[PDB]
Design a protein around this ligand. Structure first.
Ligand code: HEM
Ligand SMILES: Cc1cnn(-c2ccncc2N2CCC(C(=O)N(C)C)CC2)c1
Length: 437
C-alpha cells in the first residue's frame, strides 16, 4: 500500500519492460526488482540530483546478491558492494592510486600484447568459413588482460588454459542471476564462489612470498588492494576486493567488446570509416602508443554509441531516506531509487530516433547528453575502472579493425540477455577474412 499511489502497471530483458513503463507512466514508476519494490526515476533532473551528491548513498539491500550468494561470501564489502560512505571512501582513495594517468599509461604494453595475441589467433582462422565465437574470444582476451594488468598473473585463457576457472566464473554469474530471479545448481554455484576466493588466497600468498624473497613486484591494482587492508584483523576484506576486481575488471569490458563487434557486423559504412581511421592513425604499426588512442576520435564515438544502446551495466540504486517529491510524485522514505542508462538511452524524449546507431551523436560539434547517458555511472560512485576499460577496448578494437573483416553468421541474433550484466544473447558467431581479401 505505501507505493500503490505511484504511477505504474496494474532477447528481451526486464530493462525493456521498464523502458515500456517509463514511456507509458512517466519519469517516476513503481517496479519490482531483485524481489524488492523500487522506483525507477528517468528524468535528467533526478539523475543529477541523486547521483551528483554524497548525501545519497547506495541502497545496500539492492547489492545483497553481489555480497553473498547461497550463503557463500562473493564481493562481500569490496569497492562495488560497500554502501557505507566512510568505509567505501577509505578504500576508494587508496585503490585510486592504481588508476592514476601514470599507472594506466604503464598498462599499454599488456593491452597491446594480449590484443596482438588475439588477432594472431583470429587471423589463423580467417578462411571466410570457420565460425568463431567473438563473445568467447573477447572474454578470454579481457580475462587475460585483467589477470596480467591487475594481479601480474598469466591466466592464458587465449591458449585454452584455466578451463575450471572459466567454468567457476560462468556458474558464479548464473548464481547472481538465479539469486535475483536445485541441489546440483546450489552445489555448483557454492563451489565456484569458494574456488574464486581460493584463487585470491593462492595469488595473495604468491605475492607475499615474492615480496619476502625480495623479488621485483611492479605496483598494480593488487598492491593497492593489499595497501587498503594494511593492519586489518584478517584477509576477508582483501579477498572481497580481489574477487571484485577479478570479475568486474573483465566481464563488462568483454560484454562491451562483444556488443560493439555484433552491432558493427550490420554497419558496413561505419566499419569502412573505422578501418580508414586506423589506417591513417597507426598505419602498419604493430603497437598502439598512448598518444595514438586520443587520435582514434571516430572509434571513440562508435564506442560511446555502443554504450548508449548496449550498456553492460544498466544503472545503479540510491537509498531515499526521507519522503521526497520527485517530478510531482510523492516517494516514501526508505525507498530504493533505480537509475537506468539503458532505459534513458532508448527514450525518444532524450535521444532522437533512439534505435538508430549514429556515432555522430558524440561528434565534436554535437551537444553532449546532459544526465541522460551514464554507462560508467556518475558522481562519487562512478566506475573506478572507466579509463582502464576505455583504453583496453580501444586497443583491442583498433587491432581488430587493422587486420580483419567480420561477417556475422546468418541466424545470429542482436538480442540481449541479463546475467549479472547485459550481454549478447548469442555467441556473436562470425566468419573472418584478412583485410585486403
Ligand atoms: C566497459 C566497461 C565497464 C563498464 C560499462 C562499467 C560500469 C560500471 C558502473 C555502471 C559502475 C557503477 C556501479 C554501481 O553504481 O553499483 C561501476 C563501478 C565499478 N566498476 Fe566498472 N565498468 C566497466 C569496467 C570496469 C573495469 C575495467 C573495472 C576494474 C578494473 C571496474 C571496476 C568497477 C568498480 C570496482 C566499481 C565500483 C566503484 C566504486 O563504487 O567506488 N569496472 N562500473
Ligand atoms: C558481477 C559483475 C560483473 N561485472 N560487474 C561490473 C564490472 C565493471 N564495473 C562494474 C560492474 N558491476 C555491474 C553490476 C552492478 C550491479 O550488480 N548493481 C548496480 C546492482 C554493479 C557494478 C559486476
Amino acid at each position: 500500500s505505501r507505493y500503490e499511489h505511484i504511477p505504474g502497471p496494474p532477447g528481451r530483458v526486464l530493462q525493456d519492460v521498464f523502458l515500456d513503463w517509463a514511456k507509458k507512466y512517466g519519469p517516476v514508476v513503481r517496479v519490482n526488482v531483485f524481489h524488492k519494490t523500487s522506483v525507477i526515476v528517468t528524468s535528467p533532473e533526478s539523475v543529477k540530483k541523486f547521483l551528483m551528491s554524497t548525501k545519497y548513498n547506495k541502497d545496500s539491500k539492492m547489492y545483497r546478491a553481489l555480497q553473498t550468494v547461497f550463503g557463500e561470501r562473493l564481493f562481500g564489502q569490496g569497492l562495488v558492494s560497500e554502501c557505507n560512505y566512510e568505509r567505501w571512501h577509505k578504500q576508494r582513495r587508496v585503490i585510486d592510486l592504481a588508476f592514476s594517468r601514470s599507472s594506466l599509461v604503464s598498462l599499454m604494453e599488456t593491452f597491446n600484447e594480449k590484443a596482438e595475441q588475439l588477432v594472431e589467433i583470429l587471423e589463423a582462422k580467417a578462411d571466410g568459413q570457420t565460425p568463431v565465437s567473438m563473445q568467447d574470444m573477447l572474454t578470454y582476451t579481457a580475462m587475460d588482460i585483467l589477470a596480467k594488468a591487475a594481479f601480474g598473473m598469466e591466466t592464458s585463457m587465449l591458449l585454452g588454459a584455466q578451463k575450471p576457472l572459466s567454468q567457476a566464473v560462468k556458474l558464479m554469474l548464473e548464481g547472481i542471476t538465479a539469486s535475483r530471479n536445485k541441489r546440483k545448481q546450489l552445489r555448483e554455484v557454492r563451489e565456484s564462489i569458494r574456488f574464486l576466493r581460493q584463487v585470491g588466497r593462492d595469488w595473495v600468498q604468491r605475492r607475499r612470498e615474492a615480496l619476502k624473497r625480495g623479488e621485483e613486484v611492479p605496483a598494480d591494482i593488487l598492491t593497492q588492494i593489499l595497501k587498503a587492508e594494511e593492519g586489518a584483523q584478517d584477509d576477508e576484506g582483501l579477498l572481497d576486493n580481489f574477487v571484485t576486481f577479478f570479475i568486474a575488471g573483465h566481464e563488462t569490458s568483454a560484454n562491451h567488446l562483444a556488443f560493439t563487434v555484433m552491432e558493427l557486423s550490420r554497419q558496413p559504412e561505419i566499419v569502412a570509416r573505422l578501418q580508414a581511421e586506423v589506417d591513417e592513425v597507426i598505419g602498419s604499426k604493430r603497437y598502439l602508443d598512448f598518444e595514438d588512442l586520443g587520435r582514434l576520435q571516430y572509434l571513440s564515438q562508435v564506442l560511446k554509441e555502443s554504450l548508449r544502446l548496449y550498456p553492460p551495466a544498466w544503472g545503479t540504486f540510491r537509498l531515499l531516506e526521507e519522503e521526497t517529491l520527485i517530478d510531482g510524485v510523492r516517494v516514501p522514505g526508505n525507498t530504493p531509487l533505480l537509475f537506468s542508462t539503458y532505459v534513458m538511452g532508448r527514450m525518444d524524449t532524450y535521444f532522437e530516433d533512439p534505435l538508430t546507431f549514429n556515432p555522430d551523436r558524440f561528434g565534436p560539434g554535437a551537444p553532449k547528453p546532459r544526465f541522460t547517458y551514464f554507462p560508467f555511472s556518475l558522481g562519487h560512485r562512478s566506475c573506478i575502472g572507466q579509463q582502464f576499460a576505455q583504453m583496453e577496448v580501444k586497443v583491442v578494437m583498433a587491432k581488430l579493425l587493422q587486420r580483419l573483416e567480420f561477417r556475422l553468421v546468418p541466424g545470429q541474433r542482436f538480442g540481449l540477455q541479463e546475467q549479472a550484466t547485459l550481454k549478447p544473447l548469442d555467441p556473436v558467431l562470425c566468419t573472418l577474412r584478412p583485410r585486403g581479401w
